[PDB]
Structure formats: structure tokens, C-alpha cells
Amino acid sequence: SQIQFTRHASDVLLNLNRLRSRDILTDVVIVVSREQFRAHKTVLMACSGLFYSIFTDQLKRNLSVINLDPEINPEGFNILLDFMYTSRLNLREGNIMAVMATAMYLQMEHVVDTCRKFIKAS
Amino acid sequence: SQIQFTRHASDVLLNLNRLRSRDILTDVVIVVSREQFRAHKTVLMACSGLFYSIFTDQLKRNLSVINLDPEINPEGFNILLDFMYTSRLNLREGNIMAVMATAMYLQMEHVVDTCRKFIKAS
Ligand SMILES: O=C(Cn1ccc2c(=O)[nH]c(N3CCC(Cc4ccccc4)CC3)nc21)Nc1ccncc1Cl
Numbered sequence: 230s231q232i233q234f235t236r237h238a239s240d241v242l243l244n245l246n247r248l249r250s251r252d253i254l255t256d257v258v259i260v261v262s263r264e265q266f267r268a269h270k271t272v273l274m275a276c277s278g279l280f281y282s283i284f285t286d287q288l289k290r291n292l293s294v295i296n297l298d299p300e301i302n303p304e305g306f307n308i309l310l311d312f313m314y315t316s317r318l319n320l321r322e323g324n325i326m327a328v329m330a331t332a333m334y335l336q337m338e339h340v341v342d343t344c345r346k347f348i349k350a351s
Numbered sequence: 352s353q354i355q356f357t358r359h360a361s362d363v364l365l366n367l368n369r370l371r372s373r374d375i376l377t378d379v380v381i382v383v384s385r386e387q388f389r390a391h392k393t394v395l396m397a398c399s400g401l402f403y404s405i406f407t408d409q410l411k412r413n414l415s416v417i418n419l420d421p422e423i424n425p426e427g428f429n430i431l432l433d434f435m436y437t438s439r440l441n442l443r444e445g446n447i448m449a450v451m452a453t454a455m456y457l458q459m460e461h462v463v464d465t466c467r468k469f470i471k472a473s
């Protein structure tokens with residue numbers, strides 16, 4: 230009973246990543262050792278179980294700075310952060326493990342599973 | 352060189368609409384005559400030329416209340432607001448005009464064009 234716009238969701242995600250590229254309405258900085266990454270809490274909740282659980286919590290929802298455990302690999306987080314904003318996963322042999330272990334910490338179950346299927350295909 | 356996750360963008364949009372259904376991280380109320388609608392500015396910028404232009408403007412970006420012209424049809428705005436959050440357009444013969452004229456006011460060019468193709472198919 231309703232017309233489906235099959236590329237609207239990808240169009241929207243492209244525009245959210247535009248806004249993040251320009252720092253418009255970003256509302257948190259993620260400290261990953263020496264790196265910082267600004268983002269929209271909503272987009273992070275929408276992609277990670279770690280961030281969903283942190284920010285649904287009234288006690289932590291209005292945080293503007295999140296410090297990840299300094300054991301997180303910054304490249305792995307950047308590749309996953311970009312995945313969140315583009316729906317594209319840069320998996321190389323060269324960083325599969327770092328990405329997997331970072332996607333587990335971030336409670337990104339489907340991405341972790343894709344990494345398991347990635348291993349097999351090696 | 353990158354694995355494409357073909358439903359990630361739709362999954363994300365579903366979660367943003369969950370958050371809107373629960374009022375998590377909503378940051379504006381849209382007054383349309385007697386109706387109010389809470390939403391995420393980012394999602395509205397990502398879908399409407401009116402809201403993009405209002406909120407990219409540093410002078411208006413931190414508005415928490417937008418009052419639309421009381422000539423806007425509230426049903427038409429609700430159908431378009433829901434489209435923004437689901438990628439589904441409820442076009443009926445019964446409200447095509449109201450939706451079209453509301454999508455023009457909101458600078459939603461593709462939706463307006465779909466309404467023109469909708470007319471033809473009548
Ligand atoms: O789904 C995401 C974000 N995302 C994406 C993948 C993924 C993942 O693999 N795991 C989780 N978890 C957090 C909540 C989970 C189940 C749950 C659902 C509802 C209430 C309690 C628990 C378990 C772990 N989140 C994930 N966000 C989201 C979820 C629900 N409603 C709105 C949004 Cl925005």
C-alpha cells in the first residue's frame with residue numbers, strides 16, 4: 230500500500246556522513262589513544278551494541294567524550310566507524326584480526342560474523 | 352576492495368526510527384498547527400532541503416523548536432516525516448495533492464517527482 234524508495238536509506242547515510250565530514254551536529258568525540266573521532270551518537274547507537282548500551286543509559290547519554298580502552302586498535306576503530314557511515318567494510322588480510330577484535334569490543338555482531346566468513350575464505 | 356553490506360543503510364534507518372519512537376536523542380520539535388512532532392535534526396537535514404538549509408545555518412542550527420507555516424497540512428507532513436524514517440511513501444489518491452504540495456514546501460525533490468509520476472499513473 231506504500232511506495233518503497235529503494236535507495237533512500239543509502240542516500241540518507243551518505244548525507245549523515247557529509248554532516249560528519251563537516252562536523253555539523255556531531256555530539257561526541259571518541260578518544261582512541263592518541264586519536265580523536267567526532268560522530269553522531271545516534272549513528273553510533275544505530276550500529277554498535279557498546280554505544281547503544283552506553284547512550285540509552287540516562288546516566289551516560291549526555292556524555293560528550295567517550296574514552297575507549299587504550300588497548301583498542303585505532304585503525305580498526307576507524308575502519309569500523311567508516312563502515313558505520315558508508316556500509317562498506319575494508320577487510321584486508323593485513324588487518325582482519327585487528328578489525329575482528331575491535332568489532333567484538335564494539336558489539337557489532339554481523340561485522341564480526343563477516344570476519345569469521347572472511348577467515349574461512351582464507 | 353571493500354565488502355558492501357547491502358542492508359546496513361536500511362538497518363541503520365530502522366534504528367534511528369526506533370530512537371525517534373522512544374524519544375532518544377531527539378533534538379527538535381516541529382510545530383505543525385495543533386500537532387507536534389519530535390525528530391533528529393540530522394535525519395531531517397538528510398531528507399529535506401528546507402531543514403538542511405535551516406540547520407546548516409549557524410544562526411538557526413541550535414533551534415529546538417521549528418514552527419511550520421500554519422498552511423502546511425499536518426497529515427502530509429506526518430506521511431513525509433515517516434517516509435524520512437522508513438523510506439516508504441503512503442501515496443493514496445485521497446491525499447496525493449496534500450502530500451505533493453507538502454513535499455514541495457519541504458524541498459524533497461525526488462518525492463515531488465514521484466508524486467508527478469503518481470498523477471500520470473492516474
Ligand atoms: O541495534 C543497534 C545497533 N547495533 C547494530 C548491531 C548491533 C549488535 O549486534 N548488538 C547490539 N546490542 C545492543 C542491543 C542489543 C539487543 C537489544 C535491543 C533493544 C533493547 C535491548 C537490547 C544487544 C547488543 N546493537 C547493535 N541499536 C539499537 C537497538 C535497539 N533499538 C534501537 C537501536 Cl538504535
Ligand SMILES: O=C(Cn1ccc2c(=O)[nH]c(N3CCC(Cc4ccccc4)CC3)nc21)Nc1ccncc1Cl
Pocket residue numbers: 244245247248396397398399400401403404458459460461
Ligand atoms: O540532500 C540533503 C537533504 N535532501 C534530500 C533531498 C533534498 C533536495 O531535493 N534538495 C535539497 N536542498 C538542500 C541543498 C541542496 C543542494 C546543496 C548541497 C550542498 C550544499 C548546498 C546546496 C539544494 C536544496 N536537500 C535534500 N541534505 C544534504 C545536502 C548536502 N550535504 C549534506 C546534507 Cl545532509
